[PDB]
Amino acid sequence: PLLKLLPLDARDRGTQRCRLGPAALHALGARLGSAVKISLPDGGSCLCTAWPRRDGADGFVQLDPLCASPGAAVGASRSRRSLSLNRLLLVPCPPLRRVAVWPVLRERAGAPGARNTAAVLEAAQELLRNRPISLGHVVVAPPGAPGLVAALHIVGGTPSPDPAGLVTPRTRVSLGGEPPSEA
Amino acid sequence: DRPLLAVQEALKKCFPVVEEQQGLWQSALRDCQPLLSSLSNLAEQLQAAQNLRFEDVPALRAFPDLKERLRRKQLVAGDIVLDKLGERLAILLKVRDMVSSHVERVFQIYEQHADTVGIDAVLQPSAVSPSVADMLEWLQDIERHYRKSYLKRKYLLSSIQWGDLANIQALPKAWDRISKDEHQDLVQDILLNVSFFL
Amino acid sequence: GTLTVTNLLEKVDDKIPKTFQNSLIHLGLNTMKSANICIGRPVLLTSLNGKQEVYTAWPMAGFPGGKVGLSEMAQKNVGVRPGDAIQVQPLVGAVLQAEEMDVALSDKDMEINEEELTGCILRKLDGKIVLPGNFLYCTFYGRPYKLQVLRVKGADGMILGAKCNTDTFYFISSTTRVNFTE
Amino acid sequence: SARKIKDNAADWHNLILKWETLNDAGFTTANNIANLKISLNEELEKLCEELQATLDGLTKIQVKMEKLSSTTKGICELENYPLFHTWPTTHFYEVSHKLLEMYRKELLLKRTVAKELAHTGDPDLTLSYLSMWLHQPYVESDSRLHLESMLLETG
């Protein structure tokens, strides 16, 4: 078929999920809260969580680009472009034993240095709870989020999270710290 | 059918916990206000005991070894307050862990059953109960709300150092702000919308 | 599909949400079921004169069936009075977010406070589905007001200013902008 | 018939009493609003809301006494085809009509002072408005006398 792309009201805009009408939900048959790899029409895929439309409506797709493709974030808003259903994909999600990240920090301008790794590690482990992420992606932090972290460029994934993978509450989070392919 | 009854029991089993725990959260929060006020006050006093010298003022001059013997009292009377705050925050932590465990239990049951229950059967509202989908969504939103509130509370409260006597004198406002920025009473409206249990 | 208008319960029995303080039409569980009316959902009101307005149903267990309490301003907009009959329809169609709305004052001709007002309209009405040519009611710091819908622009690139139960609608969210032109 | 009239009298009395009481409460409210304004959000808002509630209580009183007036006029007309102490019993309707007119215009003025009290500039307006609220400048004192006189003729 063909789907419009409305903007995203505030409530969802906070979190990760992407809404969708029961038509396409019946189409790709994902129960709920699943992963859906979405390929923006501007280059750079994206990943979001499924949740039904509020009013049994049809043919529209609101989505939020939390687990984006690097730099291609804003390309998700400010449009009226269509989105064909084939541009969406159901992706399996494994429990992803251990992960490894390289974080930017928020500009707490006034005190950098040695960064009390327990703090940043706790904040990151928080921001990664129960989310599905797919390797090679930024994970922005929601506005007014707590703590210090503001990015989780995803690099190390133990059971090879190339399609995607679910970070579980019992997963080591190695703050490796290798900024990859900066050009 | 039976799966739908499973998730239904799960849901209207999880909610009363959320209600009571919210009540506990609330009460525990309300204790923190006057304590924090008094702490701001002690901060103000201790602020206005470095702006003197105590070596040059007529009367106090005959009192050697005072400036110290005062501070080393104000600090104790502050430290006791701050440990009371610590206790309150431990209460808060207990409640977040409780709620998070229960919500995860609910989702796990659902994921256990969400293959033999067409999402259309999941997603259809009745006359006396919102849609199952909306119920799970609200549960998840409650858990995220509790988590963010708790953690922002802590990273506010554990940045108190006798030595930045300006910041410590703004707590009672930054706190209140951290409270007046979530959505107005989530648990309240969710509890209402589900009052008709199912 | 048929129902007798009445007046709601006097006190706001605090078993009521807060995103719904306005735009409520109390009902009864029995009359809730007899027309497929689900809690928290919207619903449509059709007048015997050809006027329409939409409201958020709510099953508050008060008066019995046949009777559907409204608000006074609702009864004005619909233009009915107690005892009278009205048509109720469970909304089924789409519901999107409404970007642009243009209304003109009822000529209270207060010293115009263009943006000062929107800050209260939005914070006081988010949820009220609208329609071309209706009346709103904010109370910006005590004083009253009365507006008039003229046009709405809907993010699905459409324009109004919406008569049957299976069409578009629109509602105000914290991103809608408004203009004030006669 | 006349029994209804005596009831109208006693009701006039108690109604005006409740009026005054509610006006007192509202005056306290308006004092709070004026002070809170002079000191410099949503607190002010809850204030204005409960003030409006006071106004609605007022309006309820107004509609009850209007019904009183209507019934009195009805009995007046029905006495076409004389009392305890020989009054015209038209005089009664005259009394109730003067009362009604006074109090209704009063209500209008109260409504305007509510409508304006929130956002006022120079303080002198604020004092004059508090005044307008308290002194009820549309109730000629003899009113009470009038009522008393009428109230007198029926115990």
From Swiss-Prot, chain A:
Family: Belongs to the AAA ATPase family. AFG2 subfamily.
Record annotation: effect of changing residue 30 to P: In NEDHLS; reduces interaction with AFG2A and CINP; reduces cell viability
Single biological process term from Gene Ontology: autophagosome maturation
Function: ATP-dependent chaperone part of the 55LCC heterohexameric ATPase complex which is chromatin-associated and promotes replisome proteostasis to maintain replication fork progression and genome stability. Required for replication fork progression, sister chromatid cohesion, and chromosome stability. The ATPase activity is specifically enhanced by replication fork DNA and is coupled to cysteine protease-dependent cleavage of replisome substrates in response to replication fork damage.
GO MF annotations, alphabetized: ATP binding; ATP hydrolysis activity; identical protein binding; polyubiquitin modification-dependent protein binding; preribosome binding
Cellular component annotations (GO), alphabetically ordered: cytoplasm; cytosol; nucleus; spindle; VCP-NPL4-UFD1 AAA ATPase complex
Assembly mode: Part of the 55LCC heterohexameric ATPase complex composed at least of AIRIM, AFG2A, AFG2B and CINP. Associates with pre-60S ribosomal particles.
Domain of life: Eukaryota
Expressing tissues: Expressed in both neurons and glia during embryonic and adult stages of brain development.
Region called Required for interaction with AFG2A and CINP, residue ranges: 1-178
Pathological condition linked to this protein in its record: Deafness, autosomal recessive, 119: A form of non-syndromic deafness characterized by mild to profound sensorineural hearing loss. Sensorineural hearing loss results from damage to the neural receptors of the inner ear, the nerve pathways to the brain, or the area of the brain that receives sound information.
Residues of the full protein shown: 12 to 194 of 753
Subcellular location per the Swiss-Prot or TrEMBL entry: Cytoplasm; Cytoplasm, Cytoskeleton, Spindle; Nucleus
Record region (Disordered): 160-183
Keywords on record: Acetylation, ATP-binding, Cytoplasm, Cytoskeleton, Deafness, Epilepsy, Hydrolase, Intellectual disability, Non-syndromic deafness, Nucleotide-binding, Nucleus, Repeat, Ribosome biogenesis
Keyword Manganese: no
Curated annotation (Swiss-Prot), chain C:
Resulting phenotype, residue 169 to I: Reduces protein stability
Annotated spans, Required for interaction with AFG2B and CINP: 1-161
Effect listed in the UniProt record for changing residue 142 to E: No effect on protein stability. No effect on interaction with AFG2B
Top-level lineage group: Eukaryota
Cell compartment(s), UniProt: Cytoplasm; Mitochondrion; Cytoplasm, Cytoskeleton, Spindle
Record remark: domains: The first ATP-binding region binds ATP with low affinity whereas the second ATP-binding region binds ATP with high affinity.
Function: ATP-dependent chaperone part of the 55LCC heterohexameric ATPase complex which is chromatin-associated and promotes replisome proteostasis to maintain replication fork progression and genome stability. Required for replication fork progression, sister chromatid cohesion, and chromosome stability. The ATPase activity is specifically enhanced by replication fork DNA and is coupled to cysteine protease-dependent cleavage of replisome substrates in response to replication fork damage.
Oligomer and partners: Part of the 55LCC heterohexameric ATPase complex composed at least of AIRIM, AFG2A, AFG2B and CINP. Associates with pre-60S ribosomal particles.
Membership in a protein family: Belongs to the AAA ATPase family. AFG2 subfamily.
Disease the record associates with this protein: Neurodevelopmental disorder with hearing loss, seizures, and brain abnormalities: An autosomal recessive disorder characterized by intellectual disability, intractable epilepsy, microcephaly, abnormal muscle tone, and sensorineural hearing loss.
Protein name according to UniProt: ATPase family gene 2 protein homolog A
Gene giving rise to this polypeptide: AFG2A
Part of the intact protein present: 44 to 336 of 893
UniProtKB/Swiss-Prot annotation, chain D:
Stated consequence of mutating residue 125 to R: No effect on interaction with AFG2A and AFG2B
Keyword Cell division appears in the UniProt entry: yes
GO cellular component labels: nucleus
Record keywords: Acetylation, Cell cycle, Cell division, Coiled coil, DNA damage, DNA repair, DNA replication, Nucleus, Phosphoprotein, Ribosome biogenesis
Major site of localization recorded for this protein: nucleus
GO molecular function terms attached to this record: preribosome binding
Localization (cell): Nucleus
Stored InterPro entries: Cyclin-dep_Kinase_2_interact (IPR023250)
Description of post-translational modifications: Phosphorylated by CDC7 but not by CDK2.
UniProt-listed GO biological process terms: cell division; DNA repair; DNA replication; ribosomal large subunit biogenesis
Quaternary context: Homodimer. Part of the 55LCC heterohexameric ATPase complex composed at least of AIRIM, AFG2A, AFG2B and CINP. Interacts with AIRIM. Interacts with CDK2 and CDC7. Interacts with the components of the replication complex, MCM2, MCM3, MCM4, MCM5, MCM6, MCM7 and with ORC2-containing complexes. Interacts with ATRIP. Interacts with CEP152. Associates with pre-60S ribosomal particles.
UniProt function note: Component of the DNA replication complex, which interacts with two kinases, CDK2 and CDC7, thereby providing a functional and physical link between CDK2 and CDC7 during firing of the origins of replication. Regulates ATR-mediated checkpoint signaling in response to DNA damage. Part of the 55LCC heterohexameric ATPase complex which is chromatin-associated and promotes replisome proteostasis to maintain replication fork progression and genome stability. Required for replication fork progression, sister chromatid cohesion, and chromosome stability.
Protein family according to the UniProt entry: Belongs to the CINP family.
PANTHER family membership: CYCLIN-DEPENDENT KINASE 2-INTERACTING PROTEIN
Protein name listed in UniProt: Cyclin-dependent kinase 2-interacting protein
Species of the source: Homo sapiens
Lineage: Eukaryota, Metazoa, Chordata, Craniata, Vertebrata
